[PDB]
DNA sequence: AAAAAAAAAA
DNA sequence: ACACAAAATATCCAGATTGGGGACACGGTGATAAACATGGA
DNA sequence: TCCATGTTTATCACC
């Protein structure tokens, strides 16, 4: 809201409200998936494809093997979301997920080789699975 | 640089030398007929089989004696052998990794 | 009248300063961003505490100590038994309130604030690290005996790295009140720095000096790259110290002292500095510090 | 440029490998290759962390056909190594 | 008081310590690397468990008697950690992270604090390569048995390395009532140090020490380069002659204690030459530790 | 504060101008300690070796003591481009300034 | 459930 | 010491299998101070 | 030109 209020006409498109917001809420307000996707756009500075990839991996895992999961879901992601914050192996879990799975497939190479994308981008959406 | 391009050139020269040893270099004999093309191709895959023999040997061809066999085999046939000879002694270890890539060029096949 | 300052380093070993406040499953140490890389940091407060502890050790009068018998961090001797008549390094500590021993005016005529004679800076590493390295494990509970009752069954891991690091420090010369036996003890204790870390039962890092450069002319600091990288053993200012006395005279080489490993690597240029006046090439840092203390306070 | 070229060439090796190998049959040929990547990945796993030495060892044993004027392709990858493994096994996913 | 600290290395042999648990199809050993080379895989707390284990065969009281009955690994305890009632696992009455109160500080004035007086660090190998496997398999019973393990037969490979790796340690402590016998027992037990990193029915390994060196027992901490001797060769002779040299003319020294492997093969004339202060030479480590404990303990 | 102290050590202190008002190089526009004066004004001085007066505007950067010492020594200008210690530089600059 | 080719000089 | 000749055709692995079970921290605290401007007799 | 004073209320909206 403060961001919108010569180069400030459409600056809200980027809306980089990740710097000051995340540092304060580290210790006190840490006490989930409500804010999981919030940092996704900041990491890049493409989304639905990763969601399907993660869903297929878990479905395949349970197929081969063939009420409190929400609390376990919140804790599991927090263990790796916090470590993803500090990063400001990452090619290992996606390696299995892709193996579980073509113009958009060509675009993966150009959207993954960037160091910034390697450091913090690809390791967010897949966490929603397990 | 000149190193890599000369390595590729000598690899191609070795391929052509193997083709000449196998049969005549006149490829117009090979082309122009489905039967002649097929027999030339079959000779190509038997050369490819020899290439697989060389490659599977290459993994166990690092240190000393297989190194002698590899230096016996290359059939470099180069114009000015002084530079090519002297340039390969200094890089004792990485030449294996580059020459296996060069021997991957022994695959014209069909 | 004769200011001084030095920079010291230590031998390589696994890291020790494990802050470990990140979260339950990790133990993250402090980091700094240098030229796009991450480097380890040790705050000056740890060194101040270690110097205080060693001043305790050498049988020197003191006005502060810990108790380790309270729910949270606490220090008792700092303010309880002391009128702040004479601190450890003449710090003469302070605290602000509506009144403090009748504003410490009538009973003991001292300034409300403090002195802060000693100076120090941050300690920074020399080479970066590469993410998590070590694993860990924790026991379940006290088991049969019901006294711990953690009910954790946890399994975590911490972070370690291998690096030697260096830091500078300074000291003014015009402060010469009650100097002859107070400050020289501190300078002698600078040579030890054993227990300065955040844990020793598993790390055991020692700040043993390896090389020292501890002199310039009687003026203010020239700032000749006080954070000298030392190139993991070398020194980047050999060219800036050769011209001991010549037409250019672009460097005072008559006031310098060199540490151990910078002289152990014998060379002809080492003899060139030896014949050059004021080099004073030494081999044992502790006797170098003793000689500096003798020639700076008494002389 | 580099990413597109390497993606095409990795697809080329995967296609050549599947050609070299050889209705519910299509599923089980698809099913068998689901684990071939798993056994291959462990084999490549046992290689130097830097993988500059290994990727050369990996491809020479890996059957090939052609990769578009070998001279140009090989000479580019020397300057920028330690990046090929980022997609060396993602290509076979699209083969199915 | 006197403070001693020493360093050891073990004999070369194939070894394995599976710790990563990276996946099911593989087990990794690597812990930490230096200068682009993966070297070290020693956890500095497993040796503490080994010492706790071998204080029992020598006839000392214990509290943390590990048991394996419940599914999750767990340990039990005696009535309460008491540093004075008995050996207290070598004076290791530790902290209680609970607000249950009823602590002995209310009754027995036990401060919930330790008597550590023991420091160590993780071991470091001397060989980088770790990329070999064995490729064994686990079969499936499927033989009309009363229990099935996994209902599958699998192929999996381990990871091995042939390296001899060193170990530093320091004590720098002091004795109290009934303590000297316990510290003598600890010095006796440190010689054997078998069964490190848990049991191993397929990869036998021992920590028998050869070429042990102890430094600067009488005075305060002045040692340097605890990780010195490596590369399957002696290193502390040149360090001895280059820092705190045996000559008393220019570089003063201190009494040292050397192991047996170094003197087993070394110049015969050099033994006579290295006799300025007499030094201390022995052929077997056990006698050296016995004499060193007798001298340091004062009795 | 005393701990973690920072000090201003002068290094590559370089600027001069004709008896006019401030202009020319904006006194800013420098990189992250890599090579700062060069892309700022050294190219302009080379292109204006006869337009901007290099006789009175002497060289810049103590780093010239380390790389490209000679080339900067002759092919730049014949002015007093001495750079050994900033102390003597300030001393003789003050002497020249007080001269006229 | 999808394919690609010929060559040297003191 | 002269001349002549220096190999040729078939073939370069086939199956079955790629881990299972339990656990991913426990408590205590989250600054403290000093630095005035206008009115009615 | 120069003599003076004042404050008082706790807490809330998401998957």
Short mmCIF file of C-alpha atoms in Angstrom, two decimals, chain E residues 13-16 194-195 200-206:
data_model
loop_
_atom_site.label_atom_id
_atom_site.label_comp_id
_atom_site.label_asym_id
_atom_site.label_seq_id
_atom_site.Cartn_x
_atom_site.Cartn_y
_atom_site.Cartn_z
CA UNK E 13 43.25 -49.46 7.44
CA UNK E 14 39.96 -49.47 5.49
CA UNK E 15 37.23 -47.71 7.43
CA UNK E 16 33.58 -46.70 7.17
CA UNK E 194 38.35 -49.28 20.68
CA UNK E 195 34.87 -49.53 19.19
CA UNK E 200 31.01 -52.60 13.34
CA UNK E 201 30.66 -56.29 12.50
CA UNK E 202 31.79 -55.80 8.89
CA UNK E 203 34.41 -52.99 9.05
CA UNK E 204 36.81 -53.66 11.90
CA UNK E 205 38.81 -50.62 12.98
CA UNK E 206 40.91 -49.57 15.96
#
